[PDB]
Amino acid sequence: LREAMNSPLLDKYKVLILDEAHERTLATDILMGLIKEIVRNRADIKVVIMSATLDAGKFQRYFEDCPLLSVPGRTFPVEIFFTPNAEKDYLEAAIRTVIQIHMVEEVEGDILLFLTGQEEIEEACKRIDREIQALGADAGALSCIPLYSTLPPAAQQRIFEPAPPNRPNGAISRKCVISTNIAET
RNA sequence: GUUCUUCCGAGAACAUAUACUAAAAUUGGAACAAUACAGAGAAGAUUAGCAUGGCCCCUGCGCAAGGAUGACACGCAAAUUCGUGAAGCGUUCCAAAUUUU
Numbered sequence: 576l577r578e579a580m581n582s583p584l585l586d587k588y589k590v591l592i593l594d595e596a597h598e599r600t601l602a603t604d605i606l607m608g609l610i611k612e613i614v615r616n617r618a619d620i621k622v623v624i625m626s627a628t629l630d631a632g633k634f635q636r637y638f639e640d641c642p643l644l645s646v647p648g649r650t651f652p653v654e655i656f657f658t659p660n661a662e663k664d665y666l667e668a669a670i671r672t673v674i675q676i677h678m679v680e681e682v683e684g685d686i687l688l689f690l691t692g693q694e695e696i697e698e699a700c701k702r703i704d705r706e707i708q709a710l711g712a713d714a715g716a717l718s719c720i721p722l723y724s725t726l727p728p729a730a731q732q733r734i735f736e737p738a739p740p741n742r743p744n745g746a747i748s749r750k751c752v753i754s755t756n757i758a759e760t
Numbered sequence: 761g762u763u764c765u766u767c768c769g770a771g772a773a774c775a776u777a778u779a780c781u782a783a784a785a786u787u788g789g790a791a792c793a794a795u796a797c798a799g800a801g802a803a804g805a806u807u808a809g810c811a812u813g814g815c816c817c818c819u820g821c822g823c824a825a826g827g828a829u830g831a832c833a834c835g836c837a838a839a840u841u842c843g844u845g846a847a848g849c850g851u852u853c854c855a856a857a858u859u860u861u
C-alpha cells in the first residue's frame with residue numbers, strides 16, 4: 576500500500592500475490608479494490624489472491640468470477656469435542672477442564688487454552704496452580720505459562736521451554752500455555 | 761261592742777292574734793299525630809322461652825304475671841414485662857484483543 580501511493584499502477588510489478596486474505600486487514604481490503612482497479616488499466620499484470628481458509632468463494636465473485644483453485648493439505652487430523660450442556664461460568668469450566676485433562680489423558684502433550692485477556696490469563700494461571708498444588712505427588716508437574724501480546728520478551732520466551740522429564744511414577748508432566756488469540760495466528 | 765257602777769263622764773268585768781295570706785301576675789314539665797322510609801334475641805334457615813347487669817322505664821294490689829325473652833349487652837375484645845444471634849455500617853469500588861504503514 577505504501578508503494579502504490581507513489582506509483583498508482585504498481586509499475587514495478589508483474590505478478591502480485593495477496594496472501595492470507597482471510598485476515599482481511601485494512602491494508603488488504605484497500606489493496607484488493609485498487610488492485611481490481613489496476614486489473615483494468617495495466618492490462619498485463621497477474622493477480623493471485625490466496626486465502627488459507629476454505630472461504631465461501633466470495634473472492635471468486637468479487638474479481639469477475641476468476642477461477643478458483645482449491646488445494647488441500649493439513650498435516651494431521653484433529654478430534655473435535657463439545658460439552659453437551661452449556662456451562663454457565665466459562666473460566667470455572669476452563670480451569671476445571673485443564674485439570675481434568677492433566678489427570679486423565681495418557682498421551683504426552685501440552686494444553687493451549689484460549690481466554691479473553693490479561694485479567695483472565697493471569698487469574699487462570701493462579702487458580703490452576705492452586706489445584707495442582709492440591710493434587711500433590713501423584714500427578715505430574717503442570718507448568719502454567721501466560722502468553723499475551725504485551726508480555727516483555729523474556730516472559731514470552733518461556734513458550735519455547737520444554738516440559739519437565741515427568742515424575743518418576745510415570746505421571747505425565749505438561750506445559751499449559753494460556754493465551755489470547757496470539758496463539759491462533 | 762254589750763252588761764254593771766255612779767257623781768256623771770268617766771270607771772270595772774267579759775272577750776285576745778285567722779290566712780300556701782290572691783278575684784291574680786309571671787314561669788316551666790310530660791304526652792300527642794305521622795308525612796316517605798326499613799327491619800325487631802340464639803354460630804344456614806323457621807322460632808318457644810327462663811335467667812343474668814343497672815344513673816332505663818311502662819301495665820299491675822303485687823315478693824304473681826306481662827311489655828320484642830320490654831329495651832340496652834353485641835369488640836380497637838390489648839392489663840403489672842422481655843430474651844435472642846446474623847448483617848450494613850463509623851464511608852467506600854469498578855482497568856488493554858490483535859496489529860500495520
Ligand SMILES: [Mg+2]
Binds near residue numbers: 802
Ligand atoms: Mg336464629
Ligand SMILES: [Mg+2]
Ligand atoms: Mg313477650
